[PDB]
Amino acid sequence: LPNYLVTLPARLNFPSVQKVCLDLSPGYSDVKFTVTLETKDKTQKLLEYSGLKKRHLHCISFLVPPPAGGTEEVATIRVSGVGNNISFEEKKKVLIQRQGNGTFVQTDKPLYTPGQQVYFRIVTMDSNFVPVNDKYSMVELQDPNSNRIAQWLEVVPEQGIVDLSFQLAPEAMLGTYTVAVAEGKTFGTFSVEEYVLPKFKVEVVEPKELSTVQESFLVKICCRYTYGKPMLGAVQVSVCQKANDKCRNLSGQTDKTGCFSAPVDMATFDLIGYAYSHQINIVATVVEEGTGVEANATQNIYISPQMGSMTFEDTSNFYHPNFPFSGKIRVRGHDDSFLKNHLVFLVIYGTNGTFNQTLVTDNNGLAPFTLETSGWNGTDVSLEGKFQMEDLVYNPEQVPRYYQNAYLHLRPFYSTTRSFLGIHRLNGPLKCGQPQEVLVDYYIDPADASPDQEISFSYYLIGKGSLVMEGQKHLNSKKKGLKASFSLSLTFTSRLAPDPSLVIYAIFPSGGVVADKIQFSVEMCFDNQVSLGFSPSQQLPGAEVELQLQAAPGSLCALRAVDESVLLLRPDRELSNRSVYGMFPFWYGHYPYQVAEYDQCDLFSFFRDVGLKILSNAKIKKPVDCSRQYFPETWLWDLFPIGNSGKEAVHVTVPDAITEWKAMSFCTSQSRGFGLSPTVGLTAFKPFFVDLTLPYSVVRGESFRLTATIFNYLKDCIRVQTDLAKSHEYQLESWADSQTSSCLCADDAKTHHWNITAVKLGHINFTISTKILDSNEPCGGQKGFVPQKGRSDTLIKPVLVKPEGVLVEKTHSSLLCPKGKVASESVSLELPVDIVPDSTKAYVTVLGDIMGTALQNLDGLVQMPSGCGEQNMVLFAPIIYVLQYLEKAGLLTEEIRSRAVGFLEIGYQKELMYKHSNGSYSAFGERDGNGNTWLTAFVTKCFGQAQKFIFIDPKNIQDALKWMAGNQLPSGCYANVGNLLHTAMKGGVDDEVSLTAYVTAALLEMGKDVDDPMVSQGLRCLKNSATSTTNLYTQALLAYIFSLAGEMDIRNILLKQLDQQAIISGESIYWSQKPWSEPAAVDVELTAYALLAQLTKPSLTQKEIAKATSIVAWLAKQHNAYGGFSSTQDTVVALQALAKYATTAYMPSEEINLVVKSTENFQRTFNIQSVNRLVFQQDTLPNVPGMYTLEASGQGCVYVQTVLRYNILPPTNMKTFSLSVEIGKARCEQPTSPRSLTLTIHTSYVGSRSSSNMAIVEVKMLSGFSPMEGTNQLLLQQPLVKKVEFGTDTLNIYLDELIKNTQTYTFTISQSVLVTNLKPATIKVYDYYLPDEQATIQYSDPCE
């Protein structure tokens, strides 16, 4: 009786092909054997064949049918042998699926400080590691506040991968940002928080996890710097053990190596019983002498058992009856440590008997074993292998040690053949690509076999589910019963699994089967063979290195070169050729996959675990089983398309560090596949490391200490040689060795000192010059070693030498507007008699139009510290208004578009921290409960008009309108929660009509229609007070809300109201609440409201423009300094007005000829073209400040400004704010290096109003001083302080409402650099929205 075999793969994946195989016995030869599959949509023939006179094995590849009715479905594979009126038919239910393509997100770091650009890559792969070029529809980047802040649409992948960039804000939120891919199918999370660790790290080396067989131990508490340097200090070490707390404390001092050894004995703690905790903690507190700071180290040690657990990792699920089965057992203790000469007990349970036997192990922990199944006689048996007779002990009060017995159950190799085929496994991990040689012996039983035929072995090499290789070996069966062996040749790729299989079966044409499979263990390899090599991988920081990258031809690769501690932070979250695996292989265990068809619930028991869809006609019918250091910037993050040669050599420059760089790469190719490289290291080694401690802030005429500490790194004695370049910008006194070389040996430090005084101003560079020289004298009994590289170092560090006194700026903006004629203007700028010498500068700015001064200074505008929600919008909202001007006039080029939108997500990220859990936007954020409704209207207006430029989430605008629904009165008007606004035009108590006007005008400007219900409801509120209003700011804003809509009959009424209170200041008219050009604050924004109400007529009127250019002629001369309109809200309202005027009165501006003239016969020419209208034209005036002459000719309306800055010994005010300070503590006889002196500041508002709007007290620091560490917390603990900010030389403290009462704020400062002859330092308090109401005093130090 001849027999046949049909084999198909189990899972039928869509984008690739599979393989079908047919095995036919000698005999038949007239019977057509065919395989075909039937689906619900189509049917194709897989294979037709006819029998031969020999044993044949035919295998062909086939493409799967497309899936229908979803992704997962079940087809029917159908085998027919037809002939001699005999039909062998079957029907087997087989599963066909569209598999899930694997994908991952690779970020640049798992941890970023704020202010760094995040880079990431998105990679999609199939199950065979070929890249997928399916287009990503929409990808997003979200904050820790679950709010999307970036979004890319319709992004295409380049060879399956795509890279993206996102610049974070300098003030960014803290938490895990999330990159979401394809509506949230893929998440990549990276943490962003600000970590700076200047404290020296205290570590251990020899303390590790301990066992119970330890009676004594040595603890090496070693305290070292972040770059790595020992110091001398006293260490107290508490080694404690908790209770379900036996502790011992010791004290010592570290040596010159910095590692202190202490004997810790286990007998002082709980070691036998488990009534106490199983974890022992070491707390080391280090106090350095002369510092007083305490460094804390916590190290936990868990008590580990001596032995681990046994699992039958390499054990077959069957047994050969009446014939021996051999194998090996790997024995190891705890955490995969091999135990030499360990003892293993194995017991069999069955009907024959529960026999026990014992085995000894070798030094490698691999013990061979043989088992004889002569007496079992086809019965179900159980295997139990353990270490000893001891088992698990259960106790609710004590945590037991982990133990797991090696238990298995075996069921009866179901056949009619008693021949034997050998089992030959080869070691642990295997290699890929090399032809592996394996030998497997066999045996032939003469009773069930005939010597006339020839023997044949058919083997299937199966990996990643489907069968990969096949083959046949025909040998002579005339030798009959012997222990012969046959050879095999094996090629392994990534198509083979990490745990693939090889099955051999021999089948006789007279009758009988014998089968055996071997499970392998291959290292997770790839079709793409990549190599990330370095030259020379020991390079000095500063010189370029050669990176060689090898892959398959036609590949796209991606580098990630970063610090080693970035890899040491997270053991996971990197590509380590296990992360790219894992999601794919889960086909183990169960033979069907959502298929209810079974055979007897053996060949079925063989092909249950790793096998295929296999059917035959042999004996198969039997019931069987059916179941910690810093994180610097990253070195490389680049993309590289490599050529057909497969090599890519790139010269890349190392960063200036002392650390060791690690690089990781992956390569993607459509022809071959994916390839991942291990992390290959490059050490950046420098011989000597210097550290220049230098004060940022210093006043001229002071002195400070220049410091040039050199820390050795080589393990010998070197001769350093420090130098300072002599310059005329500073004078010096040599406290150092004065160009004398020293003997610095290994792990030894030296400190130099210089006394530096300053005679100039500005940024002054200090240049160090250190060099190991060729010594003529031996140091420490040995010759001074000269390294061949890194022999020199030239570090340059700057100082900011600010002048004494306070900076007073003076501006005189002009609006020469030539209507075909010559327009002239004189500028009068004068200096006081008490100016600080050589501190005066003057500069004239010429531009071709308006809305280009804001365009140059889109960042900034105000000179004020933007740390609140009402003031952040000078870096967000005039960008929207100037680009509305450039979009409605068609002058928006692409480069200013890209710069402005980059500033826009910077302002978006900075604004989004003032959002709440609700939709409202307060000023300071997360401390005010419910936010301000007016600022919510302002941010809703500038989010509605910015979503056509950048990506704004519509969810936060929708929550803003939900908060508008929450603040809608039944009278039709708009209310507010809390008392925190701008100047409020009189100090207004009601403010309801102006608030409702601004909310509804913001809704109309953002894009809502008149027939909108909130807009119509606010307008129905304002018909009540449409005419009867008195405040000029409220009248101009009310003329804006009635001029945005089409209520012209009362817009003309309000215009006639505004013509009564319009101050006719010559040819320029304007409006003011309380009636050289020094600007005021609220009159600028209310005449901006008047100008905005003028220019919102849809019908152009020539009489309207004649009044409008007079209002512009007043409004554009109030430009304070570089940005304009001194405060923040004044600036955004007046730039909105001037942008609306510039849209509604747009000019061609072909050419303007302008002459700047002065009294020193200094004249210069500016020429304005059409394209040259948006350049910030600048000239520093060399004249002594007096009068200047400005004339313009041509067609257009240009803007000219002149800014004068000088320094003044600051006079007091004593009429708006009363300000005083005094200095306590300060020692003056025991100064040391932390000269901690306190400052107590008494503030009050003695002005005319009931309360100031919002105040900034600006402690400009003394030279070389810092505000200690805890002053931020103890200033937030004091009342009426919302935010304290120390940028680089000033402490700005933000006050909510400063009043008639006197508030005392105290804070202590400590210097970092020693300073001598301290100049006085200023303290200034101003109203934020009225900066001219300021009070400036000065303080000093009573010692020097």
Numbering used by the authors: 20 to 263, 277 to 633, 670 to 695, 730 to 1177, 1186 to 1454
Please quote the paper that reports this structure.
Human alpha-2 macroglobulin-like 1 (A2ML1) is a monomeric member of the A2M superfamily (A2MF) of protease inhibitors and complement factors. The functional inhibitory unit of A2ML1 is a monomer that depends on covalent binding of the protease (mediated by A2ML1’s thioester) to achieve inhibition. A2MF protease inhibitors utilize a unique trapping mechanism that pseudo-inhibits proteases regardless of their catalytic class. Trapped proteases remain catalytically active but are prevented from cleaving protein substrates through steric hindrance imposed by the inhibitor following a proteolytically triggered conformational change.
Structures of native A2ML1 were determined by X-ray crystallography and cryo-EM at resolutions of 4.4 and 3.1 Å, respectively. Overall, the cryo-EM and X-ray structures are very similar with an overall root mean square deviation (RMSD) of 2.0 Å for the entire molecule. Native A2ML1 is organized in two structural units connected by the MG7 domain. The N-terminal residues Glu19-Phe787 constitute the MG-ring formed by MG domains 1–6, the associated LNK region, and the bait region. The C-terminal domains CUB, TE, and MG8 encompassing residues His904-Glu1454 form a compact structure with extensive CUB-TE and TE-MG8 interactions, which we call the CTM8 body. In both the EM and the X-ray structures of native A2ML1, it is not possible to model residues His696-Asp726, suggesting substantial flexibility of the intact bait region in accordance with its accessibility toward proteases. However, in both structures, it is evident that the strictly conserved residues Arg730-Pro734 pass through the same narrow opening that houses the Nt-α′ in complement A2MF proteins. In particular, Tyr732 and Phe733 in the BR-C region form a hydrophobic plug inserted between the highly conserved Leu130, Leu216, and Val598. In native A2ML1, the bait region is threaded through a hydrophobic channel, suggesting that disruption of this arrangement by bait region cleavage triggers the extensive conformational changes that result in protease inhibition.
